[PDB]
């Protein structure tokens, strides 16, 4: 029984950290986020879009 | 907030897969003896009937000469480790002249009109040993983990 | 000799109502 | 003319089946791993885990020590070769004592109460390699070419 | 807003509880004997009365022989230091065979079927001066930073 976090065919995103030693990093979480729903809309051509995070 | 259009293309080859419709000629009275036979690999010819007139066709081997390929049949077909293969006693379709795709173990483009040379298990590579009079006919495409070639086929 | 059981592997399956079909956008 | 009637008589027991109703006790906490295990034959242990609580076992083989024998389930079982197996990744019933029917490679009856001598793929048979701690529990009968021996296991 | 969903695990078992419900034995015409008796712990017989039939129990000493393993009851023990214990001069119940969570005084996973060895006050030790003839069943957890072992008990 595979997990959802183990499947070997689900798009894997490598990220910097949101919180690096007590601060906070708006920006990247904003750009990391935009680029996994901009992924998702175009890996499937416009067939599928994100609904929920 | 934008709308947006996206662009797909459609794989052009296939094992087995008839090129165009060319002049081309299908033996399909003959049968599969001892073993198995890949779709879009060639065959050989053990010994034929003289009085029943059936052929009898294996898969090519060390030092024999190949008569023709195996082609694509919704219906003849049996779909066995994720592939189209003949299986034994069961009528079979060769196909002895015209244009087919047949699967390569090659790596670079082959030059048009070349003499064809297959490997001993009856798939197309650039340094076999096995020699045919069959030509190239240019066209190469990349399947997803699959390399076929065009193969031009005459009667033997 | 054969030695199986009662009920063969078929009918005890299930088979999904939907198909599958990849999407090739025109342009 | 005269009438006739004629008789026949059942076969007494087969592979992987409870002999009797004395004193048994099945496992059902287990799991197949990395093969696959024929029905009537021993199995042995690889690996228990330490929180989850299931038991990785698999087919005997040499330098090893038995620890039950697979029964007949018409449930849990797949049917492969012609005979019933339990299939890679999957639950097993493992009986851990009792008394019950298993293949056999032998050729004369055994004696009452000797010690279950094992070949290296988990059936009984005579001056075997692995030592095992059951019995024989007096049984000895052939149905339809497979030979067939009556063990006592012992709880471990 | 957001909102939160939160996850949280039980604990796995508790000292003194039976494991599995696998063919076991309990015996109940047991007395203790001089002190207390801690739930999850060794115990041994020092006298069998010949008439009347009840087997005097008392704590693991030195050189001598395990009988049996206390369990868990929320009726015939007593709360002291937070914990359940038998008191002197009442019933007990003792299992002989079977799959019991016992406490343990070790550090590193033990191996299964391995034999178990116990320390002289009775709880479970990796390397001990008394040996005996039950056995590690693979299980091993820790409640609350105690640490419990699965053993499977013999009939003596």
Redesign the interface.
Request: proline fraction near 3%.
């Given at each position: 029984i595979v997990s959802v976090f183990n499947h070997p065919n689900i798009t894997k995103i490598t990220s910097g950290k949101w919180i690096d030693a007590s601060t906070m990093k708006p920006e990247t979480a904003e750009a990391e986020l935009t680029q996994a729903i901009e992924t998702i809309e175009t890996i499937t051509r416009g067939q599928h879009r994100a609904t929920n995070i | 907030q934008i709308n947006?259009?996206?662009?797909?293309?459609?794989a052009i080859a296939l094992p087995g897969m008839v090129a165009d419709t060319s002049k081309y000629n299908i033996d399909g009275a003959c049968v599969v003896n001892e073993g198995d036979v890949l779709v879009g690999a060639a065959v050989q010819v053990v010994q034929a009937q003289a009085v029943d007139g059936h052929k009898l066709v294996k898969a090519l081997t060390t030092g024999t000469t190949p008569y023709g390929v195996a082609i694509r049949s919704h219906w003849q077909t049996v779909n066995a480790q994720n592939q189209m293969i003949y299986e034994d006693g069961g009528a079979i379709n060769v196909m002895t002249s015209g244009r087919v795709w047949m699967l390569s173990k090659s790596t670079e483009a082959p030059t048009f009109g070349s003499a064809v040379k297959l490997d001993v298990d009856g798939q197309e590579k650039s340094d076999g040993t096995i020699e045919t009079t069959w030509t190239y006919a240019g066209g190469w495409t990349k399947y997803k983990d699959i390399q076929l070639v065009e193969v031009q086929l005459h009667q033997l | 000799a054969a030695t199986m059981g009662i009920w063969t592997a078929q009918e005890l399956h299930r088979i999904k109502s939907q198909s599958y079909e990849e999407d090739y956008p025109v342009g």
């Amino acid at each position: 029984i595979v997990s959802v976090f183990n499947h070997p065919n689900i798009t894997k995103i490598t990220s910097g950290k949101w919180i690096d030693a007590s601060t906070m990093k708006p920006e990247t979480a904003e750009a990391e986020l935009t680029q996994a729903i901009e992924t998702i809309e175009t890996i499937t051509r416009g067939q599928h879009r994100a609904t929920n995070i | 907030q934008i709308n947006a259009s996206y662009q797909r293309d459609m794989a052009i080859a296939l094992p087995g897969m008839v090129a165009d419709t060319s002049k081309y000629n299908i033996d399909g009275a003959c049968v599969v003896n001892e073993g198995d036979v890949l779709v879009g690999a060639a065959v050989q010819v053990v010994q034929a009937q003289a009085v029943d007139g059936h052929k009898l066709v294996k898969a090519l081997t060390t030092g024999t000469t190949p008569y023709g390929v195996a082609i694509r049949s919704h219906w003849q077909t049996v779909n066995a480790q994720n592939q189209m293969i003949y299986e034994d006693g069961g009528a079979i379709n060769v196909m002895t002249s015209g244009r087919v795709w047949m699967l390569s173990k090659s790596t670079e483009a082959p030059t048009f009109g070349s003499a064809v040379k297959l490997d001993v298990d009856g798939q197309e590579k650039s340094d076999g040993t096995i020699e045919t009079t069959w030509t190239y006919a240019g066209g190469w495409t990349k399947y997803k983990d699959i390399q076929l070639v065009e193969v031009q086929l005459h009667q033997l | 000799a054969a030695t199986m059981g009662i009920w063969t592997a078929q009918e005890l399956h299930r088979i999904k109502s939907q198909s599958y079909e990849e999407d090739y956008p025109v342009g």
